[PDB]
Amino acid sequence: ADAKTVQDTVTQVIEQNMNGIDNLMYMSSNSDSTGTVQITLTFESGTDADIAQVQVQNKLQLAMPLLPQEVQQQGVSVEKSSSSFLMVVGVINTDGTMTQ
Amino acid sequence: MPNFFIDRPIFAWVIAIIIMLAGGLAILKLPVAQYPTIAPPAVTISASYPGADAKTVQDTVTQVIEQNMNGIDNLMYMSSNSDSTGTVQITLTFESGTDADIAQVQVQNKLQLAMPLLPQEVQQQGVSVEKSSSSFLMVVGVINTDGTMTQEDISDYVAANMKDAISRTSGVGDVQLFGSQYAMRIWMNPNELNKFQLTPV
Amino acid sequence: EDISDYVAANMKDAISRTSGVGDVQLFGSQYAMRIWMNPNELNKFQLTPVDVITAIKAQNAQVAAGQLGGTPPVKGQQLNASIIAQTRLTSTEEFGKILL
Amino acid sequence: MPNFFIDRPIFAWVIAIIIMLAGGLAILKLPVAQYPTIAPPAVTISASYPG
Amino acid sequence: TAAAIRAELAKMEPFFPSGLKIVYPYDTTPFVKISIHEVVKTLVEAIILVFLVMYLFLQNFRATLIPTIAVPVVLLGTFAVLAAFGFSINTLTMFGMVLAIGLLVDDAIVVVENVERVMAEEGLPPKEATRKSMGQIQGALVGIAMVLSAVFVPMAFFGGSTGAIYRQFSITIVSAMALSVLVALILTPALCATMLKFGWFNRMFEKSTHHYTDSVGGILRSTGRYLVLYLIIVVGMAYLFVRLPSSFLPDEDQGVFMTMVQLPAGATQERTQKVLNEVTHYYLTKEKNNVESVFAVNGFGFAGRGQNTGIAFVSLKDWADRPGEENKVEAITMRATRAFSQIKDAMVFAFNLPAIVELGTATGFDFELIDQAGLGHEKLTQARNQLLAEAAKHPDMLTSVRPNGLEDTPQFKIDIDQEKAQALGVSINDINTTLGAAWGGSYVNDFIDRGRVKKVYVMSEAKYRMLPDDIGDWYVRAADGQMVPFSAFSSSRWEYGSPRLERYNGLPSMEILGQAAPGKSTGEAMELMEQLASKLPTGVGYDWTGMSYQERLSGNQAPSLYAISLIVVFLCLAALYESWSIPFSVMLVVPLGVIGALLAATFRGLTNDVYFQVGLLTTIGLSAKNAILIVEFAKDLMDKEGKGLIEATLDAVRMRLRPILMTSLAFILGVMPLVISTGAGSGAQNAVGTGVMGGMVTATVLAIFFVPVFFVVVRRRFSRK
Amino acid sequence: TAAAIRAELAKMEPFFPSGLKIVYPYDTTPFVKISIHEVVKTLVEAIILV
Secondary structure, X not given: OOHHHHHXXXXXXXXXXXXXXXXXXEOOOEEOOOOOEEOOOEOOOOOOHHHHHHHXXXXXXXXXXXXXXXXXXXXXXXXXXXXXXXXXXXXXXXXXXXXX | OHHHHHHOXXXXXXXXXXXXXXXXXXXXXXXXXXXXXXXOOEEOOXXXXXXXXXXXXXXXXXXXXXXXXXXXXXXXXXXXXXXXXXXXXXXXXXXXXXXXHHHHHHHHHHHHHHHHHOOHHHHHHOOEOOEOXXXXXEOOEEEEOOOOOOOHHHHHHHHHHHHHHOOOOOXXXXXXXXXXXXXXXXXXXXXXXXXXXXXXX | OOXXXXXXXXXXXXXXXXXXOOOOOOOOOOOOOOOOOOXXXXXXXXXXXXXXXXXXXXXXXXXXXXXXXXXXXXXXOOOOEEOOOOOOOOOOXXXXXXXX | OOOOOOOOHHHHHHHHHHHHHHOXXXXXXXXXXXXXXXXXXXXXXXXXOOO | OHHHHHHHHHHHHHHOOOOXXXXXXXXXXXXXXXXXXXXXXXXXXXXXXXXXXXXXXXXXXXXXXXXXXXXXXXXXHHHHHHHHOOOOOOOHHHHHHHHHHHHHHHHHHHHHHHHHOOOOOOOOOHHHHHHHHOOOOHHHHHHHHHHHXXXXXXXXXXXXXXXXXXXXXXXXXXXXXXXXXXXXXHOOOOOOOOOOOOOOOOOHHHHHHHHHHHHHHHOOOOOOHHHXXXXXXXXXXXXXXXXXXXXXOOOOOOOEEEEEOOOOOOOOHHHHHHHHHHHHHHHHHHHHHOOOEEEEEXXXXXXXXXXXXXXXXXXXXXXXXXXXXXXXXXXXXXXXXXXOOOOOOOOOEEEOOOOOOOOXXXXXXXXXXXXXXXXXXXXXXXXXXXXXXXXXXOOOOOOOOEEOOOOOEEEEEEOOOHHHHHHOOOOHHHHHHXXXXXXXXXXXXXXXXXXXXXXXXXXXXXXXXXXXXXOOOOEEEOOOOOEEEOOOOOOEEEEEEOOEEOEEOOEEOOEEEEOOOOOOOHHHHHXXXXXXXXXXXXXXXXXXXXXXXXXOOOOOOOHHHHHHHHHHHHHHHHHHHOOOOOXXXXXXXXXXXXXXXXXXXXXXXXXXXXXXXXXXXXHHXXXXXXXXXXXXXXXXXXXXXXXXXXXXXXXXXXXXXXXXXXXXXXXXXXXXXHHOOOOOOHHHHHHHHHHHHHHHHHHHHHHHOOHHHHHHHHHHHHOOO | OHHHHHHHHHXXXXXXXXXXXXXXXXXXXXXXXXXXXXXXXXXXXXXXXX
């Protein structure tokens, strides 16, 4: 894709719909040139995470009808923001047989 | 007993004071809501089918949604009612006490199962589920003093720029818009489409 | 398969929306508008259920139609009403008389 | 404790009426069933996509 | 939420086009905001009158600074406790403070008011007095409190749309009364052993006291007329009690209302506006001394969009600018409707939404009229039509039965011939789309407007879609390229269809609103309706939803509760005096107070609203508290003394004067404002205020010469034979 | 919930077609109602022996 062809096919749209969701602080969003769209949404101090992720998510569920078919096939996931935790096992091959 | 503080005061003269800050603090942060909550929760799916028409809205969407509404705890009644302005509103009054977050959830599981049967046009239209009072919190006036813009220009400004965050602000259960945001409009003409041998298709 | 229909489309909905009443599995099946293909007799007309389906699909469907005195009207306008267009087959005679 | 009440039994007796009076209403608008919530909760997903 | 909206907006303001202001039509926020704070003013200020009464009776500073600094301690503590209890500040939870400010001035008075005597017994000893006074008083404070609880708590034990409204008074006061007793065993004792201690002036009471102490006992003697006088004053209430009608919450002037304007089905947008205007104008011109703004909105259905309804948010002035009931939302909106329903050919009308009444007392009933069998729309119309019909013949009782705006309008079929069309090589698809693209909009996909994705719709220029003869313009290219016109594969015919389909609970329904107006009982109406709702052709069921759901459900008998309160006020009392007989001395006051209140409430135009029970329980109980201390001093000044018969009652009713008259005039003169109040939130204030003040005076004196009789009447008539 | 089941079921009879019965086969509710009479009775009857 690319940023416009993503910001206007998907990140918008999607985002014109985060309305309804409870305790929300603010919401930013990326649209870069590789087909990716992150759209994290930080929420007031101790709001229940399990319940915010619902609605956020739950409320995505109504924009999909307006996402384009290329995207709804890859599927939009929703999850809880942590990107760096517990341990990270690595599996290498030290005899050039297996590739990435 | 009293005796204690009778001889030794300044130990009662501090209870009172602590006790007082107690309600000092507990006032800074006590919710001054209007009055207690007494109204049962109510969710409302509400779809819409462009210039469809009442029997058509409803034999084609409303029954479809209703049918699918079950296993929903604490539900007193539901009541579809839906206009021939191409437009539906199903409002489910849950019990009293019921956790609105959840009902709102519960509802959208089952409604989810209907999405795949609605008419595409009802889909793309955008179908929605909410949890708010019927009666309006407050109205927000948007007026143009220079007269430098029109009605149509405002309902735009307003949608492009202000609904957006309102719609999205905790406790803003539902925003209506007293107008409409703009859209490219292709007011066709038949005699022409006719001349050049063209159909809206 | 006469009463099953009754309970299903006359009583299963409220019961299952009844208080305390969790899930509610029905012994029996609501009324379908069952159309039974005939193999040789379909053949007798150079016709596959494909055409059959085709038919059904345009003979028996609802169809939005707009409104005389539409949404924004010309300065004057008095008359305003819907425009019921094509529509669903409620009987079984029609399902019988569909034009293949 | 005793020595009071034993001297002053109305009050005593009074306490005994209240408890009973109080509770024993909670018999008239207290739930009833066989077992309370005993089994653990379960949840079920349900797919179903043609033969 | 309103804080946030209003500041969200804030972040906007700096960036919109040129001359683009946010004005502020109908907002409900500030009234709540002013409202609970107009009540705050009351407490704040009634802590002042109480400081002055605690003066004309005491005449010191620092000896006054002590009982007046009690309530403010107690109150503040309540707010903490409230918060503890996950509750909020709001009307109920405040009046319950106000009504409670009785229960605080008193408990303080009482104590210092007693260490005031005994300083007429011990020459000059502060600590000795306050201490001595305690003990011979401390286990008495504990008990009242342990017994007033019950004059409160058995309410807010009957739940329903209501109950939770009572639970707020209940809790507020059950506590905050408890804090009273901790202040009482902590603050008020010491501190009044810290800073404690006109011939035609002072001498007023004292001269007029013996005159009281004389007039007593002497009573009911060579004419037993007084013990009869009770049975009179009693049968006194019960009458007036059934005469005084009851209500939930007294509707108030929030400073804002709205006006409906639903024309009949199929009107035009352009007409709908006409009606709106005029409303917009009437308010503008006429009641312009009141109507500060008018946000006219047309197309906006309260039960769903429509070219035939509209709404008007009207917004008043600062109340303060609109004195007397003529400038009340009630009157404003009374004549406002008479003016409409005139010159208006549509069912216009204005009304003030009932505060706290998210359905509680919307007065009347919803009767959804369901189609229980394969019936259908037409039949059902009919079946309603009948039930609606009879409704009319029984107007004997107060009724006003009717539907909601699903009146069937003319529709214009257009029946496509799938043969002629394929016969002409037209597809059905191509047709459908053309029909309902030009006549029904269609939104193809999304263009972009200055960096905001927006919608794109194809549709017919208005002028080529306005009457059935335009369906004459659309041709449609066939597979031979020949342009073919609808009137070639189709044909149209007017008919009747419905602009709304109701369903209720999955079955087709039809809503029938209706009330039993002034006269009969909301339970008759229902009854009646149910009655004629069993005729209508076979297949037609019915049901309640809404105010009527909650009628047949949520009514958890009061008296049936308030009895469990007698039993507990008694066993407590007994408990306290150790006598299965002394306590009637006190329970018997009950009437002497509600005698005042079921009056004044009848004298003023008032009801049995809440706020009446609160000001009914706050006396019923307070009254029975000053009565304890005047039945406690006997059995004591009797059982633990050289005295007895009337010698008991003697210095008892004698000592119970200064305190009574002081509290009773500490409260009353305090609730002053409440009674005749300005205008904002008045509703609430006035009703609180008239029920108390006029039920205080009526159990202060009319009880002061009256308990004593009881007491004697009580135990003397238990030693008879 | 059984009390609502039947309560609703009462609502949908007045309209039943020509001759339709609502037999109540398999129900584990009369059991509860009993195994509570039993204990509740052995209670009074406990209270008696002591």
